[PDB]
Amino acid sequence: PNPLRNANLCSRIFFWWLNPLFKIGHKRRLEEDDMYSVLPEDRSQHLGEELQGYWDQEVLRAEKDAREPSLTKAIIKCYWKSYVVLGIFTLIEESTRVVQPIILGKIIGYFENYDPSDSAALYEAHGYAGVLSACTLVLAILHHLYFYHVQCAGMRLRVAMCHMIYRKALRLSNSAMGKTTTGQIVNLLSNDVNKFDQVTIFLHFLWAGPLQAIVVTALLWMEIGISCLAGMAVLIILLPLQSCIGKLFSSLRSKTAAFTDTRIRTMNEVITGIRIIKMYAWEKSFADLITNLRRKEISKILRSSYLRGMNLASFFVASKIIVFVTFTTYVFLGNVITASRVFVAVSLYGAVRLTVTLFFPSAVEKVSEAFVSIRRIKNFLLLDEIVNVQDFTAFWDKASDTPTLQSLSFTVRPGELLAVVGPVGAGKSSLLSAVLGELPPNQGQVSVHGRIAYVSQQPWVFSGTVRSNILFGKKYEKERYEKVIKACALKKDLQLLEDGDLTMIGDRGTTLSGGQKARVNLARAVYQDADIYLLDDPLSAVDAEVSRHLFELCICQALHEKIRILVTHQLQYLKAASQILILKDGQMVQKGEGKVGFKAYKNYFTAGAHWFIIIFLILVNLAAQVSYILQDWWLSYWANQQSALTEKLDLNWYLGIYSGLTASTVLFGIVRSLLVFFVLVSSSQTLHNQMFESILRAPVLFFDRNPIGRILNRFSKDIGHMDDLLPLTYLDFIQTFLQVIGVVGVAVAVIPWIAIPLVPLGIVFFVLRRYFLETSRDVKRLESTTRSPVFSHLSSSLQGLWTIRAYKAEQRFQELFDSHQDLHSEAWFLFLTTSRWFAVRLDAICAVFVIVVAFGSLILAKTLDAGQVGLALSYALTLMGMFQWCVRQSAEVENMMISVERVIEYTDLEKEAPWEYQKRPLPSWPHEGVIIFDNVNFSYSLDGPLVLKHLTALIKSKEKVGIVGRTGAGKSSLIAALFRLSEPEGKIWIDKILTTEIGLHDLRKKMSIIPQEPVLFTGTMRKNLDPFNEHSDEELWNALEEVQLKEAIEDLPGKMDTELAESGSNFSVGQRQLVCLARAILRKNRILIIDEATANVDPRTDELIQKKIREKFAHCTVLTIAHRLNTIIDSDKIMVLDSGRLKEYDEPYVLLQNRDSLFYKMVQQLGKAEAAALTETAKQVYFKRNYP
Ligand SMILES: C[C@]12CC[C@H](OS(=O)(=O)O)CC1=CC[C@@H]1[C@@H]2CC[C@]2(C)C(=O)CC[C@@H]12
């Protein structure tokens, strides 16, 4: 529903149909459903289909030639017929813009020749004043039509482009999915396609600027003659100069984007891995790495911002220079300054200033930015894009030494389960992809019948309700739904959830546990009730008991009659499977906010520089605008002084002060524009370092009480604004605000009575502003909140591309994208239309001011000179567009300051205890590795429960101790206390030193940790092992041999200098664990803390790391958290935490022989044979340790 369909022409132009929503919004806060729908022209589907049609056409034409296709060509062939008629606005608007200076000139002419008693003269002047008023209204209306329509053009271009990007993304080949990663594609939408909103704004000025410059040259030629050409020479120097600056700025910005992208990726992994960075004490290395990336980036930003500031200063002072040279040569040729000529010419140059030195350079800049965007988009659009298997062989990459699947033949039929079994990387998932048909055969054939269900190994969940993620477009139905929810072992959680299965889910299921989203992902598949289930190991996404529970209930009971193809290692379940196919090396081996106060402004500007510099900044701004106003006032003063005069003015005095006034205007304009960027970029720099130091020393509790995305937004969005958009908007607002104050000041200074109409007029403005703002900030909230889901959907679909492609769900997912997109388009449509509603009426009251100035000058004409009125009116005419831009820019400024307020708070976080005390331990300390807990109590927060109480234990230099206990019993709490991840109560001694009497780095660097899950960081394999670069390469190779990885690195081209991926996918999980083990080996320390290190490792690798532990750390005291009690059963003693209480600490055999020990209960829970093995092992090692 949209009343713009029903609105009469007047209501279409002036948007009167928004008025009820203004009334509502003033009375109450606007919400998502207070929002009229977009017209059928703007609908995303209809609007993207056309551009794709023309892209197909141009691809075919280039295909018939040999050349590569052009995407700019498809865009033009599509949108030219609509966009070109918009130039009639531009044509009529710019033609009236050059006529209106002529009417102005005839008004000023009445004052130049004002006679005391001619009635007919007065009547004609009133006629021109009415014509001038009407010209102003028509200009305003055409301006607003044009800008409203080009903005809709840009919106539709973005919408169609985004539709195409999304359409292409769904069909990329898995090879294209390899060289392209989610972050790049999402940056397309989030960064590059947003450049199309700006493209269409100024393109009609690529011809109208030059054509209007030629027309203005002819008009000026009749006004003043040859002197016109000096100003036009300056104009044609500015054209190449400003266009070179714009292209060079675009180049610098294109390069700096790389540093920005690298910094944001490093910062993403820092914030994500901050706990391990803290335990390793590697904070110095990331401090350095981020410091250097940020230093490079801020140098690029400083240079880029100086270029942009020079372009802005060149616009601001363009007509000052153009007028200065024009009238300098005009007076050197013997002419005289008159108010009519001067201000007519000043007005014409004002028009040329806008179109040629603002809109034409702006167009070149934005087309350049658009071409880098279009190049990336074409590089994306051109990227590559019963059951029976026989003789199957295939390559992922023909450059491989071998095929990646080979010599494959098998068949499976209704009522069967086929297991795919074997080592990691044996091609099992690749096999499933082949059966799906994602991987075509290079030889052999695949044939399948019925619908296929593909369940990815990693779970996938998208927006909406958890039930929306499960149903996946299917009808909700009680019986099948209940059968699904019970078979997927999920009912309990959906009952415990207060909003049940209607709980809303985040961008990556961040509110869900891994097992929860896993069970969601499986439930989805089972709900589809397909014929063939390709089960790519759904079970490793849940705990071992739930894994067998899902195998029995979902796979055996629910999928009972189906074909199944289950990738798994749980061979113990496969007694119930029909057949197993074993792969190796790809070949078959076997077959069978919203408001901020003055304090935020002060803090922001003072974080940049010492307040003395800010006083100088204010003074430089005042001086810039004062010299501006004064140069124009000087022309008008010169015109009045000429008009008072044979003899002539002293060109030395007048032209000298003119030259000084104009030189200081240029000087302060330049320094003002540069110093704003320096101060505000130094502010962003200081605040980034303060926020980075705070986040580095902030306690872990800060990272529990914030999600990662929320903190990373401070570094991406908010600091992004503070580097790029905010300083530019500040300079824009400051420049426009001082212009407006100068207009009003000149007006009130020339006719003081204007102050009276200005009172009601000012009151109306302020009421209107308030009444608008109330709703304006609502829609800006609602724009942001409807923008975010779009990127979320893109990213989620990219992660789940296998599954949506498997379900043939591309159609519905394009509909979803279009729905999100057109919902955002309604918010963007209210942004556009509401911002026009306000701009129109601001220009309305501004036009009343123009009317008042004009007519009041005629009412008061006995009291004024021609140059006074010419000055006042020229300035008044300039108020149109300026004043509304000022007000809306002010709203932009205040909206961005919410980002500043969000980062300034993170400069004030609480901080952990100092890394080093004034007391420091001996360099030989720890000399023995003694650990003592004595009446220790520990809680993650002062307001939280005591998760550890009365913890009291000794750990000597030689013994090995296991840490055991139920989930949440406090095991991880012990690691947190020992590293002082939260400050413990009580006494902790290490080598007769209280851990609390030394710095955090003293003890953190002297304890080794093997995390629960390995993490690798982008950069060299040397960095991931020796980030401080103090070891010899001999030691690195010894360690890499010990961790059995040397062969892979030497096979890799760079050896240790090979560039690793941020997720380490270059290496297997076991290889990642081996990187961690290598780090621990290279750091010789007395005490090693092991965190569940092998609970999920395969036995044939677990025994390897067990042996490596027995060898490389035999001298160390070792504290081991372990689910896999076989990893710790040969400890000297074991600690059992009941619930924050050390209830057991004794020899494992002595414990287990007490059948009532909690440790014995925990082993018995495993099973009788497991407990028998564990007890026998403990008994024999206890005997042998008593024997020596
Ligand atoms: C033309 C004007 C207003 C007057 C300014 O002159 S200034 O001396 O006050 O800076 C410059 C200026 C800059 C940007 C202009 C603006 C008017 C409104 C415009 C055209 C839009 O919708 C998008 C860009 C906008």
Side-chain angles (χ1 to χ4, degrees):
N2 189 327
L4 179 60
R5 309 162 190 169
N6 309 327
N8 310 83
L9 185 54
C10 307
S11 180
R12 304 177 194 186
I13 299 167
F14 308 115
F15 307 98
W16 294 116
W17 56 263
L18 286 176
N19 289 15
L21 182 61
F22 276 79
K23 192 167 187 175
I24 297 161
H26 177 232
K27 199 167 180 289
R28 56 156 289 253
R29 209 186 80 160
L30 303 180
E31 304 300 329
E32 186 182 308
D33 298 314
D34 298 295
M35 194 148 76
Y36 301 108
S37 199
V38 288
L39 304 187
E41 184 72 12
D42 289 332
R43 289 285 181 205
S44 186
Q45 180 72 319
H46 175 282
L47 181 59
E49 285 178 327
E50 54 171 16
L51 191 61
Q52 173 80 70
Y54 285 104
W55 176 240
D56 291 358
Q57 180 179 26
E58 160 61 355
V59 165
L60 290 180
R61 286 175 64 82
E63 170 63 18
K64 288 172 67 67
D65 297 349
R67 65 191 181 84
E68 184 193 53
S70 181
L71 180 51
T72 312
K73 198 166 184 70
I75 291 161
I76 291 169
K77 288 176 72 65
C78 180
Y79 291 114
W80 77 273
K81 284 172 181 285
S82 300
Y83 191 81
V84 291
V85 293
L86 276 35
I88 292 169
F89 298 140
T90 309
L91 182 62
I92 303 168
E93 185 182 354
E94 297 313 322
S95 301
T96 308
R97 190 60 184 80
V98 302
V99 166
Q100 188 201 43
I102 311 298
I103 315 297
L104 175 64
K106 291 195 180 296
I107 301 154
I108 296 167
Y110 179 57
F111 298 94
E112 287 192 335
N113 70 25
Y114 179 87
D115 284 334
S117 62
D118 187 343
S119 304
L122 185 71
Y123 305 158
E124 179 171 6
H126 282 74
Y128 293 129
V131 174
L132 177 63
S133 305
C135 282
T136 300
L137 285 176
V138 171
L139 277 173
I141 299 162
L142 293 166
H143 174 110
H144 283 84
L145 288 159
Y146 176 77
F147 280 103
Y148 177 63
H149 293 142
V150 298
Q151 282 183 307
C152 294
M155 186 200 77
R156 288 188 283 267
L157 183 53
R158 160 168 50 84
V159 165
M161 210 75 77
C162 295
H163 179 282
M164 291 186 71
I165 299 162
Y166 193 86
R167 176 176 159 79
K168 179 67 189 187
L170 289 188
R171 305 196 304 104
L172 292 174
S173 168
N174 307 143
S175 175
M177 295 157 60
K179 60 173 64 180
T180 325
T181 303
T182 299
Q184 296 164 328
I185 306 180
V186 176
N187 287 353
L188 297 177
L189 303 192
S190 190
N191 197 84
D192 296 340
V193 88
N194 294 328
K195 304 181 172 294
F196 301 126
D197 303 59
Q198 288 288 316
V199 164
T200 57
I201 305 175
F202 313 104
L203 296 185
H204 278 290
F205 303 102
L206 290 174
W207 60 263
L211 179 59
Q212 187 177 40
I214 296 156
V215 170
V216 166
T217 304
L219 291 172
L220 289 164
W221 198 286
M222 302 306 150
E223 306 313 313
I224 51 176
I226 187 68
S227 309
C228 180
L229 290 185
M232 304 307 161
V234 166
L235 194 65
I236 71 175
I237 292 168
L238 264 43
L239 269 166
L241 183 63
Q242 289 193 243
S243 304
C244 173
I245 290 166
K247 182 66 175 183
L248 176 57
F249 167 86
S250 187
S251 179
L252 289 178
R253 207 184 191 189
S254 184
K255 285 182 291 182
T256 200
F259 295 123
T260 300
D261 186 70
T262 308
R263 185 177 56 73
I264 292 169
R265 275 184 285 102
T266 314
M267 204 66 219
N268 174 66
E269 69 179 357
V270 168
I271 300 163
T272 302
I274 195 75
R275 292 175 189 76
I276 294 171
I277 293 174
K278 271 170 163 45
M279 295 195 294
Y280 286 158
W282 285 357
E283 294 167 288
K284 300 295 189 72
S285 72
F286 287 94
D288 292 340
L289 175 59
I290 293 291
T291 295
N292 292 337
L293 281 173
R294 181 63 177 172
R295 185 166 57 78
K296 285 169 163 62
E297 187 198 27
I298 59 94
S299 302
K300 294 295 189 291
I301 288 163
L302 274 173
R303 297 182 199 295
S304 182
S305 299
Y306 287 172
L307 263 67
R308 188 151 62 176
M310 286 298 296
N311 249 20
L312 270 50
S314 187
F315 158 70
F316 179 72
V317 311
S319 176
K320 296 283 156 279
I321 301 166
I322 294 165
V323 177
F324 174 70
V325 300
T326 300
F327 292 106
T328 298
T329 183
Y330 188 68
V331 297
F332 284 144
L333 290 161
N335 306 293
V336 304
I337 273 63
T338 86
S340 175
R341 299 293 174 92
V342 164
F343 283 113
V344 173
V346 170
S347 306
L348 289 168
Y349 281 134
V352 165
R353 192 183 74 141
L354 298 188
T355 58
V356 184
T357 88
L358 180 71
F359 294 153
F360 182 106
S362 301
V364 177
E365 293 162 20
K366 291 146 191 188
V367 170
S368 302
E369 297 273 290
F371 281 151
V372 313
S373 177
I374 286 165
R375 175 164 285 275
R376 289 194 283 262
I377 302 158
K378 174 175 60 166
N379 294 351
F380 186 71
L381 265 278
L382 291 178
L383 298 183
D384 190 24
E385 60 183 49
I386 190 163
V387 173
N388 170 71
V389 181
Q390 303 297 333
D391 305 351
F392 190 101
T393 295
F395 291 74
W396 293 130
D397 178 7
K398 295 184 179 180
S400 175
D401 296 341
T402 70
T404 56
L405 284 182
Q406 168 169 282
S407 303
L408 272 159
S409 68
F410 61 88
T411 185
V412 59
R413 63 182 64 80
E416 294 194 5
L417 166 61
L418 164 59
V420 188
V421 167
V424 173
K428 316 190 292 282
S429 310
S430 316
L431 181 157
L432 298 184
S433 81
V435 178
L436 185 60
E438 273 290 81
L439 171 53
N442 289 112
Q443 63 150 79
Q445 66 274 15
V446 182
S447 63
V448 303
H449 296 270
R451 294 181 298 105
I452 326 297
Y454 170 82
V455 190
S456 55
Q457 196 170 33
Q458 311 310 120
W460 177 69
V461 182
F462 63 100
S463 63
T465 66
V466 62
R467 179 156 84 209
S468 179
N469 306 132
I470 301 168
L471 298 176
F472 191 68
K474 305 303 179 182
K475 289 289 294 185
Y476 177 63
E477 179 168 41
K478 179 168 64 71
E479 307 307 316
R480 72 184 300 109
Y481 190 73
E482 293 180 0
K483 287 166 63 73
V484 166
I485 298 297
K486 75 182 65 179
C488 304
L490 197 52
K491 192 183 178 71
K492 186 169 177 281
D493 309 57
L494 307 177
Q495 294 182 326
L496 272 50
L497 294 165
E498 293 296 340
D499 200 12
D501 56 353
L502 300 181
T503 41
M504 290 286 290
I505 312 297
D507 298 329
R508 297 184 69 180
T510 59
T511 53
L512 310 172
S513 76
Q516 288 168 350
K517 69 198 306 185
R519 283 181 286 154
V520 169
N521 197 64
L522 179 59
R524 187 189 310 106
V526 183
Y527 204 98
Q528 311 318 299
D529 196 18
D531 304 309
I532 291 151
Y533 277 73
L534 310 182
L535 302 176
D536 203 356
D537 185 16
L539 307 181
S540 52
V542 297
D543 194 15
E545 180 169 29
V546 187
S547 163
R548 71 168 293 180
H549 194 264
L550 290 179
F551 179 94
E552 293 168 35
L553 280 78
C554 172
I555 308 179
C556 185
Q557 193 176 10
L559 309 179
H560 191 281
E561 300 288 3
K562 301 185 184 300
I563 292 163
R564 295 137 287 192
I565 311 190
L566 173 65
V567 173
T568 193
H569 309 153
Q570 295 290 348
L571 283 55
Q572 54 173 348
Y573 308 167
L574 304 185
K575 298 185 299 182
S578 316
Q579 48 167 314
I580 319 178
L581 177 56
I582 314 182
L583 316 180
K584 188 174 182 179
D585 199 14
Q587 66 171 12
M588 174 171 65
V589 184
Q590 310 187 356
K591 177 59 183 58
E593 298 185 37
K595 184 62 170 60
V596 286
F598 178 85
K599 250 63 70 176
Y601 293 73
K602 192 189 74 172
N603 286 4
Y604 179 57
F605 274 80
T606 302
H610 184 204
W611 52 260
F612 172 78
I613 298 297
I614 278 58
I615 295 172
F616 178 65
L617 172 58
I618 286 165
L619 264 56
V620 159
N621 273 276
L622 298 179
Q625 183 64 221
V626 166
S627 286
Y628 190 113
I629 303 294
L630 285 170
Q631 191 188 333
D632 293 339
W633 172 79
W634 189 259
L635 286 176
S636 81
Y637 171 75
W638 190 354
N640 296 337
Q641 287 287 110
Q642 189 79 59
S643 304
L645 304 167
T646 190
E647 66 189 330
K648 68 204 301 289
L649 303 180
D650 172 23
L651 284 188
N652 304 271
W653 178 261
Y654 284 95
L655 190 50
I657 293 172
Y658 188 44
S659 305
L661 288 171
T662 196
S664 59
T665 312
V666 176
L667 173 74
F668 293 136
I670 288 172
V671 172
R672 178 263 286 274
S673 186
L674 291 176
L675 186 60
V676 170
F677 281 111
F678 176 71
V679 171
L680 298 186
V681 172
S682 303
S683 181
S684 189
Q685 180 182 358
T686 307
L687 292 170
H688 176 276
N689 288 334
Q690 288 168 343
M691 175 169 57
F692 184 58
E693 287 284 343
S694 302
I695 295 288
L696 280 170
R697 282 197 62 185
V700 179
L701 183 65
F702 172 91
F703 300 95
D704 298 331
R705 298 185 173 176
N706 290 269
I708 289 162
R710 191 156 87 188
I711 302 165
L712 181 63
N713 287 346
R714 262 73 166 181
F715 291 96
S716 303
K717 275 59 175 181
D718 298 338
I719 283 290
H721 295 301
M722 290 168 59
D723 296 326
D724 183 358
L725 197 59
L726 185 52
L728 177 78
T729 313
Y730 260 107
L731 181 55
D732 199 336
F733 168 65
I734 294 163
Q735 180 175 289
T736 323
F737 177 85
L738 282 184
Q739 292 278 63
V740 173
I741 295 299
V743 171
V744 179
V746 165
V748 179
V750 167
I751 298 148
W753 301 106
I754 298 174
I756 299 167
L758 189 59
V759 161
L761 199 64
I763 290 164
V764 169
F765 157 58
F766 279 119
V767 170
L768 181 74
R769 181 183 167 275
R770 182 189 295 179
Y771 185 71
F772 166 75
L773 262 47
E774 182 59 16
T775 76
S776 182
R777 66 181 63 110
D778 278 341
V779 295
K780 272 165 174 157
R781 181 194 60 263
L782 190 50
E783 295 150 46
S784 309
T785 208
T786 52
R787 182 178 66 234
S788 305
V790 179
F791 312 154
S792 307
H793 188 66
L794 175 59
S795 304
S796 175
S797 186
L798 280 172
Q799 299 307 136
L801 188 46
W802 300 98
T803 208
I804 66 183
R805 188 178 288 172
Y807 299 124
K808 318 300 174 67
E810 306 95 319
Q811 172 56 30
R812 171 157 42 86
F813 270 66
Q814 185 61 308
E815 294 180 24
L816 271 53
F817 187 80
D818 288 325
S819 184
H820 297 92
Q821 184 68 251
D822 82 11
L823 172 63
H824 178 250
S825 306
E826 294 165 3
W828 195 261
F829 172 79
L830 287 188
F831 169 71
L832 289 175
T833 57
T834 316
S835 196
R836 287 293 150 213
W837 181 111
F838 192 48
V840 165
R841 297 172 226 303
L842 294 175
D843 261 15
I845 62 185
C846 180
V848 177
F849 192 79
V850 177
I851 297 160
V852 168
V853 176
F855 290 105
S857 301
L858 298 168
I859 294 291
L860 301 174
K862 291 187 296 184
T863 70
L864 305 176
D865 200 358
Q868 295 177 313
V869 179
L871 183 77
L873 259 174
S874 300
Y875 273 74
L877 272 38
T878 65
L879 198 61
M880 305 290 295
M882 175 207 285
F883 173 73
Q884 61 92 1
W885 190 248
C886 187
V887 179
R888 295 183 298 141
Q889 286 289 273
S890 183
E892 297 318 311
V893 166
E894 86 190 18
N895 182 65
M896 291 175 209
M897 291 297 296
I898 313 304
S899 296
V900 176
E901 166 62 12
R902 278 193 298 263
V903 313
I904 288 178
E905 63 173 355
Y906 282 8
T907 73
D908 300 332
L909 301 180
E910 73 291 349
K911 295 177 182 174
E912 291 194 316
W915 288 336
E916 291 183 283
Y917 282 10
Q918 187 65 6
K919 175 182 176 69
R920 300 183 73 268
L922 299 176
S924 303
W925 173 97
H927 59 283
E928 280 285 18
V930 180
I931 307 157
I932 297 168
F933 299 87
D934 177 14
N935 197 28
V936 169
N937 321 311
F938 161 96
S939 61
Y940 293 104
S941 179
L942 275 65
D943 63 9
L946 292 176
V947 302
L948 289 169
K949 291 183 291 188
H950 311 149
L951 172 64
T952 300
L954 165 65
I955 309 176
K956 296 187 293 185
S957 300
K958 292 291 190 175
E959 64 189 335
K960 311 294 181 283
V961 182
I963 308 302
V964 179
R966 200 178 183 280
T967 297
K971 305 192 299 292
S972 306
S973 313
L974 185 145
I975 294 184
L978 189 56
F979 276 79
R980 291 166 57 196
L981 295 184
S982 169
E983 294 283 30
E985 309 180 354
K987 297 174 185 175
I988 294 180
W989 303 86
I990 289 181
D991 284 341
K992 307 303 298 296
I993 295 185
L994 272 177
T995 57
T996 317
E997 294 189 342
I998 57 175
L1000 293 177
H1001 277 182
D1002 296 334
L1003 78 160
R1004 286 181 179 173
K1005 290 190 301 185
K1006 291 300 192 182
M1007 290 185 297
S1008 297
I1009 177 63
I1010 294 170
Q1012 184 191 52
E1013 292 288 10
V1015 177
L1016 311 186
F1017 300 96
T1018 59
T1020 68
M1021 186 65 176
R1022 206 187 197 287
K1023 272 281 194 174
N1024 279 257
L1025 295 179
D1026 177 16
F1028 300 122
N1029 296 293
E1030 67 179 335
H1031 289 72
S1032 175
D1033 301 341
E1034 298 160 308
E1035 301 170 300
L1036 303 187
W1037 285 116
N1038 274 270
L1040 286 164
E1041 287 169 12
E1042 289 281 18
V1043 305
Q1044 316 301 296
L1045 190 60
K1046 170 168 174 172
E1047 297 187 330
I1049 304 305
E1050 289 188 323
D1051 284 354
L1052 288 162
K1055 298 204 296 184
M1056 289 189 295
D1057 299 356
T1058 187
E1059 298 297 324
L1060 311 189
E1062 187 172 334
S1063 189
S1065 186
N1066 42 273
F1067 298 155
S1068 73
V1069 179
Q1071 288 168 355
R1072 299 164 216 165
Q1073 300 166 357
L1074 289 164
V1075 191
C1076 291
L1077 177 58
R1079 297 165 187 161
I1081 288 169
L1082 284 161
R1083 296 174 71 171
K1084 298 180 188 293
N1085 282 321
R1086 312 301 180 181
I1087 301 149
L1088 176 67
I1089 294 94
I1090 304 182
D1091 184 17
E1092 293 177 350
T1094 88
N1096 303 72
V1097 178
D1098 59 75
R1100 65 181 74 190
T1101 305
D1102 180 12
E1103 70 175 26
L1104 313 179
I1105 54 188
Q1106 288 313 314
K1107 182 183 176 182
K1108 302 322 296 172
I1109 293 159
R1110 301 317 182 281
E1111 289 178 334
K1112 305 311 302 182
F1113 308 117
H1115 59 283
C1116 295
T1117 299
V1118 188
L1119 281 61
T1120 305
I1121 302 180
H1123 305 255
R1124 190 178 289 191
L1125 304 183
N1126 296 80
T1127 66
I1128 59 162
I1129 193 64
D1130 59 340
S1131 302
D1132 298 293
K1133 303 182 74 167
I1134 286 173
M1135 292 172 63
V1136 192
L1137 282 65
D1138 186 19
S1139 183
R1141 292 187 176 281
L1142 177 69
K1143 293 199 75 70
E1144 313 194 326
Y1145 175 41
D1146 211 353
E1147 275 275 357
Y1149 179 64
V1150 179
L1151 292 178
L1152 292 167
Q1153 284 303 87
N1154 182 359
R1155 299 296 190 250
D1156 296 338
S1157 65
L1158 308 180
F1159 188 56
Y1160 188 87
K1161 291 181 179 184
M1162 286 196 68
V1163 307
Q1164 185 65 24
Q1165 185 61 14
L1166 303 172
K1168 291 186 294 184
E1170 301 80 340
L1174 288 161
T1175 50
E1176 183 65 28
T1177 305
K1179 178 176 63 180
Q1180 294 297 349
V1181 72
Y1182 172 84
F1183 291 165
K1184 288 187 293 185
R1185 285 196 285 99
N1186 276 269
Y1187 290 166

